[PDB]
RNA sequence: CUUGAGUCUCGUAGAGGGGGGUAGAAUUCCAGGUGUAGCGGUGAAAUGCGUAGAGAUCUGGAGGAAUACCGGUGGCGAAGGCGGCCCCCUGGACGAAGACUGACGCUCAGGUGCGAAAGCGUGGGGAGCAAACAGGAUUAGAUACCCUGGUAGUCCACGCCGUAAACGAUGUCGACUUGGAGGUUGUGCCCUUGAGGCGUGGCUUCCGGAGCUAACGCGUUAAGUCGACCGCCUGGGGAGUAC
């Protein structure tokens, strides 16, 4: 939840970025699921896959930006 | 010129062939965090063969009750 | 013959009564043309469950050359003793050539790898002498 | 919960705390912020969630 | 699983050459001495089907090298069964 | 005959296997002190836990199951699969060097052994989850999602029919042979070329010329070429059902 800290009562510094025990934490990898030989890299390629108009628009911005012809 | 400045178990063939041993629990402390986790090859300063060998000895000492294995104890 | 290594454990009350055990084990190995290359104490260690209604116990380490059947025999002696409360013995192992090697691991025991129920001073009357200018 | 607990101990004359936290729930810093704002002085915040060496099979919620 | 000292005692006075370990008889004597350690293993380790399969591999090959010796001379094959003790 | 194949010595990596042993930590559970009416559970709570002294916090005690990190397309396995620590025994691999045997070889119907899981007989065991059963909630409907509880089961030792997305998709063995890049791992030699390199030998991943390609792609481990031997299919349902 709170980790350990050199800090003076951190509660007004909006830290969450490391401040877990299981919640987006590294020990969640064997907690509450099967072994999955393929899943954990498959589920990256799948998550990324649908937002392709927004993807391609940044790519096009960068190709049009990069050439110094404007 | 000859020779150049080697890295831990580097520039030679006949070192770290067999395992890095557990009895030096003081040296093993170097290769664990403050939550009793193992540190990988890039952090122990060693390459793949030697890290696999470190991680067996680190395991050994903790389950022998000789090295730290969490921030907590009872 | 083989280079060997021996761990064994006794209660905290027996952590300055373990050199009397180490005398007999030494005498088994020297009796066999074997030699003691190191003798070392890992001190008081904390236990996940009480043995004979106490949560802590005392570890010691010997490092030797001995015939392998002596250390077969000695692993069985610990495992038949009720005062010696647990062991491990391991094949093909040797001592350090270092003097006082164990003091730095005594230091690690008293700091993070016990629950410090008992004084450092009784557990230190085991094993390797803490010659702090050698290590 | 932190404010009602700060009030719960008022008579024992404590003012100085350190803090220990466990469990997956989000009651882990908003709690502390309102704890300190109910007249106490915090100095340290430390986790005491027990973590395993693998351990036993976990409880199930939403059949996960 | 094999002692060095049994293998050594075979080639002590058998084998067609300096550092022969390879003569037909000596292959089958070394496989018998291998079998004799593994037979006493799988006797008590009845669910060790690694060792079961390894035992099978040895006795098949040893039977094919006994057969190779019986293909040379049938009396020299039965002399190898004599000198190694196998069967009632 | 030694070249295929076989054999020991010897260097060596390994989550290979079987038998037994073991340490710390955890999920779970209780009492009691302290404390005082709360706790718990979602989508909603109800079911469920309390006030008859809980939950929470401290300290004492109890059980049964499993090893987080490390960790790699890595290493190992007969395949199924194999990851904390010790002994003992043990199968297979990998490799600098010694040689040796003298085609002793290859396949394989049938045969013989193993074969994730579910189940289950036997004896032990019952933490966790949870078939069954029991109880609960939502909605127009809800036997379900969701929830409380939980026996069996799993797990230990032993036995039983064996099956699977046993999809790691490509029968075993041999020869022939494109190139490149990545990972791993044994080892001789050395400016140990810098980084260890380099030779050398095995594994393994991807990429890829040519070949092969309905198509994806595959591609020297060919979705290639040539041979030996061996399995499967032959429209769909009826159906591995019936008899």
Swiss-Prot record, chain B:
InterPro entries: Ribosomal_bS18, Ribosomal_bS18_CS, Ribosomal_bS18_sf
A GO molecular-function annotation: mRNA 5'-UTR binding
Modified residues (N-acetylalanine): 1
Top-level taxonomic group: Bacteria
Family: Belongs to the bacterial ribosomal protein bS18 family.
Pfam families named among the record's database cross-references: Ribosomal_S18
Name of protein: Small ribosomal subunit protein bS18
Function: Binds as a heterodimer with protein bS6 to the central domain of the 16S rRNA, where it helps stabilize the platform of the 30S subunit.
Taxonomic classification: Bacteria, Pseudomonadati, Pseudomonadota, Gammaproteobacteria, Enterobacterales
From Swiss-Prot, chain C:
Keywords of the record: Acetylation, Ribonucleoprotein, Ribosomal protein, RNA-binding, rRNA-binding
Extent of Basic and acidic residues compositional bias: 104-116
Positions bearing N6-acetyllysine: 93
Any one GO molecular function term: structural constituent of ribosome
PANTHER family: MITOCHONDRIAL 28S RIBOSOMAL PROTEIN S6 (PTHR21011), SMALL RIBOSOMAL SUBUNIT PROTEIN BS6M (PTHR21011:SF1)
Family: Belongs to the bacterial ribosomal protein bS6 family.
Function according to Swiss-Prot or TrEMBL: Binds together with bS18 to 16S ribosomal RNA.
Protein known as: Small ribosomal subunit protein bS6
Record gene name: rpsF
From Swiss-Prot, chain D:
Signal peptide coordinates: none
Note, other: Has been predicted to contact the N-terminal domain of IF-3 based on footprint studies; exactly how IF-3 interacts with the 30S subunit is controversial.
Subunit field text: Part of the 30S ribosomal subunit. Interacts with proteins uS7 and bS18. Cross-links to IF-3. In stalled ribosomes contacts ribosome rescue factor SmrB.
Function: Located on the platform of the 30S subunit, it bridges several disparate RNA helices of the 16S rRNA. Forms part of the Shine-Dalgarno cleft in the 70S ribosome.
Family statement drawn from the similarity comment of this UniProt entry: Belongs to the universal ribosomal protein uS11 family.
Protein name: Small ribosomal subunit protein uS11
Gene (name only): rpsK
Swiss-Prot record, chain E:
Keywords from the named record: Ribonucleoprotein, Ribosomal protein, RNA-binding, rRNA-binding
One GO process term, biological-process aspect: translation
Cellular component aspect of the GO annotation: cytosolic small ribosomal subunit
Taxonomic superkingdom: Bacteria
SUPFAM superfamilies, per database record: S15/NS1 RNA-binding domain
GO molecular function: rRNA binding; structural constituent of ribosome
Pfam families hit by this protein: Ribosomal_S15
Annotated family: Belongs to the universal ribosomal protein uS15 family.
Record's subunit section: Part of the 30S ribosomal subunit. Forms a bridge to the 50S subunit in the 70S ribosome, contacting the 23S rRNA.
Function per UniProt: One of the primary rRNA binding proteins, it binds directly to 16S rRNA where it helps nucleate assembly of the platform of the 30S subunit by binding and bridging several RNA helices of the 16S rRNA.
Name recorded for this polypeptide: Small ribosomal subunit protein uS15
Originating organism: Escherichia coli O157:H7
């Amino acid at each position: 939840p709170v980790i350990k800290v050199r800090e003076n009562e951190p509660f007004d510094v909006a830290l969450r970025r490391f401040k877990r025990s299981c919640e987006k934490a590294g020990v969640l990898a064997e907690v509450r699921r099967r072994e999955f030989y393929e899943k954990p890299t498959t589920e990256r390629k799948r998550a990324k896959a649908s937002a392709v108009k927004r993807h391609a628009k940044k790519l096009a911005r960068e190709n049009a930006r990069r050439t110094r012809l404007y | 010129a000859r020779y150049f400045r080697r890295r831990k178990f580097c520039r030679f063939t006949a070192e770290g062939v067999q395992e890095i041993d557990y009895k030096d629990i003081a040296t093993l402390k170097n290769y664990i965090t403050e939550s009793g986790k193992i540190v990988p090859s890039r952090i122990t300063g060693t390459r793949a063969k030697y890290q696999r060998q470190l991680a067996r000895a680190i395991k050994r000492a903790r389950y022998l009750s000789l090295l730290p294995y969490t921030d907590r104890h009872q | 013959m083989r280079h060997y290594e021996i761990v064994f454990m006794v209660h905290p009350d027996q952590s300055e009564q373990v050199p009397g055990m180490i005398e007999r084990y030494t005498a088994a190995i020297t009796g066999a043309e074997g030699k003691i290359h190191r003798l070392e104490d890992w001190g008081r260690r904390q236990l996940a469950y009480p043995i004979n209604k106490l949560h802590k116990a005392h570890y010691v380490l010997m490092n030797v050359e001995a015939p392998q059947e002596v250390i077969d025999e000695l692993e069985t002696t610990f495992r038949f003793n009720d005062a010696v409360i647990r062991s491990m013995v391991m094949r093909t192992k040797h001592a350090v050539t270092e003097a006082s090697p164990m003091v730095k691991a005594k230091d690690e025991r008293r700091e993070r790898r016990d629950d410090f129920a008992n004084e450092t001073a009784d557990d230190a009357e085991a094993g390797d002498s803490e010659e702090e200018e050698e290590e | 919960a932190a404010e009602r607990c700060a009030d719960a101990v008022k008579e024992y004359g404590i003012k100085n705390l350190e803090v220990m936290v466990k469990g997956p729930g989000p009651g882990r810093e908003s709690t502390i912020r309102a704890l300190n704002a109910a007249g106490f002085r915090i100095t340290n915040i430390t986790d005491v969630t027990p973590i395993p060496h693998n351990g036993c099979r976990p409880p199930k919620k939403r059949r996960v | 699983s094999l002692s060095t000292e049994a293998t050594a005692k075979i080639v002590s006075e058998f084998g067609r050459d300096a550092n022969d370990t390879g003569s037909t008889e000596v292959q089958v004597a070394l496989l018998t001495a291998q079998i004799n350690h593994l037979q006493g293993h799988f006797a008590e380790h009845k669910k060790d089907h690694h060792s079961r399969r390894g035992l099978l591999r040895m006795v098949s090959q040893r039977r094919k090298l006994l057969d190779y010796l019986k293909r040379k001379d049938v009396a020299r094959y039965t002399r190898l069964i004599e000198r190694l003790g196998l069967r009632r």
